[PDB]
Amino acid sequence: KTIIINGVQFNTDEDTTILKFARDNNIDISALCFLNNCNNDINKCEICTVEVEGTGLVTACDTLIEDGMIINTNSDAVNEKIKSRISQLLDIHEFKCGPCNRRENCEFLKLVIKYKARASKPFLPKDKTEYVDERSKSLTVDRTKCLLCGRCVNACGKNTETYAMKFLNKNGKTIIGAEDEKCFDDTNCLLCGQCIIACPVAALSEKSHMDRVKNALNAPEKHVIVAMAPSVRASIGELFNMGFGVDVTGKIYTALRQLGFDKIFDINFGADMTIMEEATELVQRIENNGPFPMFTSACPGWVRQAENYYPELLNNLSSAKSPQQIFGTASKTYYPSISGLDPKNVFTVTVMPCTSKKFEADRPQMEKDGLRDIDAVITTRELAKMIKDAKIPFAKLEDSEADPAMGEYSGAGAIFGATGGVMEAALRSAKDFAENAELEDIEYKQVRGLNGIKEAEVEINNNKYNVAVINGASNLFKFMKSGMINEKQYHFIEVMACHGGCVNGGGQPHVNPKDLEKVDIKKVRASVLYNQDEHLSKRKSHENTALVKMYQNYFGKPGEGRAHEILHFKYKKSAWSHPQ
Ligand code: 402
Ligand code: SF4
Ligand code: SF4
Ligand code: SF4
Ligand code: SF4
Ligand code: FES
Ligand SMILES: [Mg+2]
Ligand SMILES: [Mg+2]
Structure with missing residues (x-):
């Protein structure tokens, strides 16, 4: 099949996603919630947005290539969309890298820097205690950093099949946590920390x-x-x-x-x-x-x-x-x-x-x-x-x-x-x-x-x-x-x-x-x-x-x-x- 990406013609038999075909051919596409061959199905971050001619903006990480696509990865409409998404993430994000434990290797910071994104209103909670769970002997949560990208949930599912890390509806708002928001130790959680490894930010850490x-x-x-x-x-x-x-x-x-x-x-x-x-x-x-x-x-x-x-x-x-x-x-x-x-x-x-x-x-x-x-x-x-x-x-x-x-x-x-x-x-x-x-x-x-x-x-x-x-x-x-x-x-x-x-x-x-x-x-x-x-x-x-x-x-x-x-x-x- 034949596709055009940024004006470059490709003829391929590969049946894969836009993202993977692009990465294979040295074409830059950003991603965030995509990891372990999975993305966040119910809340797609859309950082991987590309423009498909005759369709509009689509998510590259979960859209299969098809014969006759004309794809733009770097049009101004694409970059404004991606910038918009990161800015919205910033709006729920305590952006204080100074004393942060992911300061030297954070995926989100790299994205913020790359797209020059800024919050509409800075997230500056006065009382972090409600955002932090340190009950566990092994794990801690800092929801001031959490992007709700679902990467911990997916990784837990794939690595353990316990699904001990879940999306939760805490008083009408979405968080991640253990079953019934209990201490992880008191659930079927293995405390293996594979969730932490999958996390792009400092939301999940060791105790x-x-x-x-x-x-x-x-x-x-x-x-x-x-x-x-x-x-x-x-x-x-x-x-x-x-x-x-x-x-x-x-x-x-x-x-x-x-x-x-x-x-x-x-x-x-x-x-x-x-x-x-x-x-x-x-x-x-x-x-x-x-x-x-x-x-x-x-x-x-x-x-x-x-x-x-x-x-x-x-x-x-x-x-x-x-x-x-x-x-x-x-x-x-x-x-x-x-x-x-x-x-x-x-x-x-x-x-x-x-x-x-x-x-x-x-x-x-x-x-x-x-x-x-x-x-x-x-x-x-x-x-x-x-x-x-x-x-x-x-x-x-x-x-x-x-x-x-x-x-x-x-x-x-x-x-x-x-x-x-x-x-x-x-x-x-x-x-x-x-x-x-x-x-x-x-x-x-x-x-x-x-x-x-x-x-x-x-x-x-x-x-x-x-x-x-x-x-x-x-x-x-x-x-x-x-x-x-x-x-x-x-x-x-x-x-x-x-x-x-x-x-x-x-x-x-x-x-x-x-x-x-x-x-x-x-x-x-x-x-x-x-x-x-x-x-x-x-x-x-x-x-x-x-x-x-x-x-x-x-x-x-x-x-x-x-x-x-x-x-x-x-x-x-x-x-x-x-x-x-
Ligand atoms: N205790 C113990 Fe082990 C040993 O020796 C470690 O320290 Fe392991 C490692 N590396 C860890 O953690 S545990 C599982 N047995 C495999 S290796
Ligand atoms: S998680 Fe990343 S972007 Fe957020 S404060 Fe820490 S280093 Fe900065
Ligand atoms: S804890 Fe980390 S991996 Fe899990 S949803 Fe929040 S930012 Fe994503
Ligand atoms: S510690 Fe392991 S079992 Fe527990 S939520 Fe994290 S990935 Fe799942
Ligand atoms: S495999 Fe090793 S690192 Fe993983 S939970 Fe078991 S002892 Fe800990
Ligand atoms: S990386 Fe594609 S929707 Fe998140
Ligand atoms: Mg998906
Ligand atoms: Mg001493």
Whole structure:
């Protein structure tokens, strides 16, 4: 078919939208509410307006190309329409970029600047308290920034299929929020924060823990531990203009020391701990023939999904604590035993690509003897802001090293942040455990990649077992609802709520939609992790020397005794009751 765009003739067989055909041919069209191959069906932002000859102004993002269209993307009538829409958005928008947390990478600001748009009347609310919801342990809303673009609603729908983020009719006016405007925590919401990632502005954010951290750092008698997740070292460089897929591990350690932290450890150490315990439990369940299947339990997004939708699976969850919590538990017990610190004075902070980790850390029973496993969780974005506020030249920092005692990690722990990561690492140790051997082939490439549902057959000690990797919360629903779970007998199942794994977590750096169609963000971030695994000497969690010492000298044998006593956590379904 033949179309004309800005006087340029195209002959094409492609059946796509104006927007995508234009972007494919280096023709500029703006968009706002269009994301994840979806726009806002009930309140189209119309930022993507173009002029079609013989029709008038149309939305490019959801209008298919047709033979014989004459399209103008830059006529004065088009630009005045787009400018008008942005101005109306400004009319309901607290335009104060100064102290805003999206100041450095906001899509809306870029649009305002591009079209020179201004409000008819500035939005200047005196009392923000009614626009702000900070009840959640993981999420916050600032409706002074909200454009009602529906991108959070669509993303929540696509990524989780819970539809926990909804349009609401609050006293005759439209907002976004949880069901019945309740606290997100009190709904079926997973707190995975995929909504935040989709948000073009600062309307959706993580629940801040930065005050917890600063207060602890400035408290004389507090000994503040910090440990970052696998994914952080593969991501945080993005916010310092270092590009995508840059390993910045050593720079992070240096920055944390300069921030005033008293001990620099690593969650990857906790990852090796979780494998120690979970691979042990797997081997146990084999020689007890059940309960099968065993599900991973390190994703609090998935744990909440199970609690809210599949409580019959809670007893199938591994009882091993997550790397975050299992690390935290040892930081209040083992670490004092090798440091002399009063356990009460230890304050443990993690850096996570995740918002759901904050909820996990603040679970009432995630403590012992009055001591929280984890006292604070800051996202990748929060650590970045903290670094920038301290004016630490991150990109120029020299590499330092972590403190070894709870900072060493194997290549198995290092790949936790990728979908299929926990599966692969668990298998490397479960195999060696069950066969009493030191096997050389350790790469399970079949469980890797961005496929939503991944299965593999594995041969453990002259017996064959079935594993599955569930990549994304919506895929958990598909896997269960479509009866896939009953099509064969599964023995070990990994579930991550965020598609791509933690590298694509709700607390990660935002990425411009244009960059998203240019960079495979999930694969590129994960590539850093697998790279570290490939070039590390020890690639099994039980080959972690610092970890072995810890178990030999303090916890004893994994999966039992002291180790099972305090390094494990069991989820329980509510007892039957009526009503509901
Ligand atoms: N706790 C824990 Fe995990 C580990 O190790 C993280 O820290 Fe993850 C990452 N990156 C997060 O958030 S959680 C899910 N298990 C996969 S990776
Ligand atoms: S959300 Fe964007 S446009 Fe609005 S105040 Fe913040 S930086 Fe400025
Ligand atoms: S919270 Fe963000 S993504 Fe959701 S409607 Fe408001 S501006 Fe759009
Ligand atoms: S945190 Fe996750 S489940 Fe909850 S509303 Fe946001 S995207 Fe949906
Ligand atoms: S996949 Fe990772 S980042 Fe996403 S909710 Fe689970 S633990 Fe958090
Ligand atoms: S981007 Fe097309 S209507 Fe919003
Ligand atoms: Mg649409
Ligand atoms: Mg201090």
